[PDB]
Design a binder for this molecule. Structure first.
Ligand code: MG
Ligand code: MG
Lengths: 339, 345
């Protein structure tokens, strides 16, 4: 395990082995490598172009140092333009029919982060591992706040912050779900990452994970047009192109799906749960639809959309019980107040 | 002057402007940029592939901040350095023959690769490698030779030391030394580690204001004139850049077995050198002469390399004495003597 060997290897643009990558990651995460080297390695790593094995190596290193809870039977809706936080809203409909272990963080792009939205609704986003398991059984849903679960990460913080650029770590979050959930919907920000991250995921041991990229470029199912997804399972990777019409609806005006703050997102969500905002509701449903498909609850996406319609109608109540059993219900009520 | 802008620019593989490069260098050298960023910039710089302008920018930033002495009439034999074969320090031995016929301002440094640095060899022979600027000028007049220890005339460099050391890889700085001679040397024989840089650095040098500088790359891959085969050189002057291929035979000798030119320590290099000055090691001596030959050519003392080789033969015969006077006027002569005893005699 010689950093300098590795660094030179990377500069020479030579991909690493899953093992090389994993050891290097462990070291970096454990804070055993000097800031100057981490900086250099990440930069080289990016300029060379991270490869599947390296993604896998790092992913494995990550999982190994995180605080874990066991709920592999759970599903997660993994993760810009500033759209309302669908994944989260969507995690709520899902909790009605299956345990949900939502991995998430605040945002670095103006309040919109799933942790912020939840915090806005009154949810107490800091859930200790012990009570986490409890909540999942008691309500079928729990939020795993990333900062609280990847404490080892602090050792790379300074470098990441100082560099202020995209490193390999930026695409690891969604592949490092604390609860080890086997069922998951994962959004990526670029088609390239679709292929890359899918192949990477194929080796991270998943029952079923669906990666998706939607026009005009979002880490979610496209509300306006084509959505490109990679279905990864124990037996391979399947490509699947899709159009928002295939759900049986007409394209949603992107203008309506955008938010400007955590509370603004919350309101748009709750309004959708009330039937006061069809656009947002449809956005939440085409996404939940794909997730339902990942759970094998439906056979086609149209079926999935339909099912989701039934779910959304019971979602505000579900949300209420979730927040009430871990958070401030009133903050939720004030948000309900026509908002 | 925003580092982060630059960094991103580099990551996106976009070459900088001589000015951009120069300001960035000044900042880094002045130690105004955090270690994490210097590390990132150098790495990006290398993975993108440094360009002429960047080389120039950094070179200018360096000079501007170096401690200087004035001896442009001097010549220097610098090597871009490399991951070569731990070869004997020819440039240095060769600087000695040159002092016989022209002032020599040898730029040089220690080394992390064993102990094969020109500063180490000189230190081994008894030379006092730390020469203050004032006495430096003196020594050059008194003996026609002086060694400018990089760490000492480029004190600003300390600010990038930690990063360079920690990284432990080739950065843009590794190819700046020879282009930043503290004496402003107008004549220079500069050896590049790859046929590539050869062109890059030549074009770069064309704008650094030189009377005549000859860059060279020799098989099987050394920052010196090839003792085994073809040597590729770029002759840069006020009126252009000339390409010149050459073979070790064009000197009138048969290829030297690389095995004989390799060393394992500063003292080992010294001995091999002194032995060559005694006539006890032809292989090393021939290595020293084909190089000195090219340098002589850069000085316009000869018209062809064969002539240069011949002239060098005459020079080497008076070199041990010259070396003696150099060390004796700035160093420990005895250490030199013990080395003379160790190299038979
Ligand atoms: Mg999301
Ligand atoms: Mg050299």
């Amino acid at each position: 395990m010689n950093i300098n060997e590795i660094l030179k290897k990377l500069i020479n643009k030579s991909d690493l082995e899953i093992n090389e990558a994993e050891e290097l990651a462990k070291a970096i995460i454990r804070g055993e490598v000097p800031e100057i080297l981490v900086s250099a390695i990440l930069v080289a790593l990016r300029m060379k172009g991270e490869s599947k094995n390296e993604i896998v190596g790092f992913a494995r290193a990550m999982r190994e140092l995180a605080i874990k809870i066991d709920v592999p039977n759970a599903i997660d809706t993994a993760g810009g333009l500033g759209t309302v936080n669908v994944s989260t809203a969507s995690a709520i409909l899902l909790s009605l029919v299956n345990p949900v272990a939502k991995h998430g963080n605040r945002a670095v792009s103006g309040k919109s982060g799933s942790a912020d939205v939840l915090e806005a609704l009154g949810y107490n986003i800091i859930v200790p591992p012990e009570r986490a398991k409890e909540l999942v059984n008691k309500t079928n849903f729990v939020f795993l706040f990333a900062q609280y679960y990847h404490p080892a990460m602090k050792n790379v913080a300074n470098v990441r912050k100082t560099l202020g650029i995209r490193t390999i770590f930026n695409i690891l979050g969604p592949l490092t779900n604390p609860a080890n959930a086997k069922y998951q919907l994962m959004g990526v920000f670029s088609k390239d990452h679709l292929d890359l991250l899918s192949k990477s995921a194929y080796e991270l041991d998943f029952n079923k994970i669906i990666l998706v990229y939607g026009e005009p470029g979002i880490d979610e199912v496209s509300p306006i047009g084509n959505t490109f997804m990679k279905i990864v399972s124990k037996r391979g990777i399947e490509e699947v192109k899709l159009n928002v019409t295939d759900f049986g609806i007409s394209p949603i005006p992107i203008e309506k799906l955008i938010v400007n703050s955590a509370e603004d997102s919350a309101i748009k969500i709750v309004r959708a749960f009330l039937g006061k905002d069809e656009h947002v509701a449809e956005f939440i449903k085409i996404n939940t639809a794909v997730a339902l498909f990942a759970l094998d609850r439906v056979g086609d996406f149209r079926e999935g959309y339909e099912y989701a319609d039934h779910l959304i109608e019971k979602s505000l109540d579900k949300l209420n019980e979730i927040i009430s059993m871990n958070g401030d219900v009133t903050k939720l009520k004030t948000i309900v107040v026509k908002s």
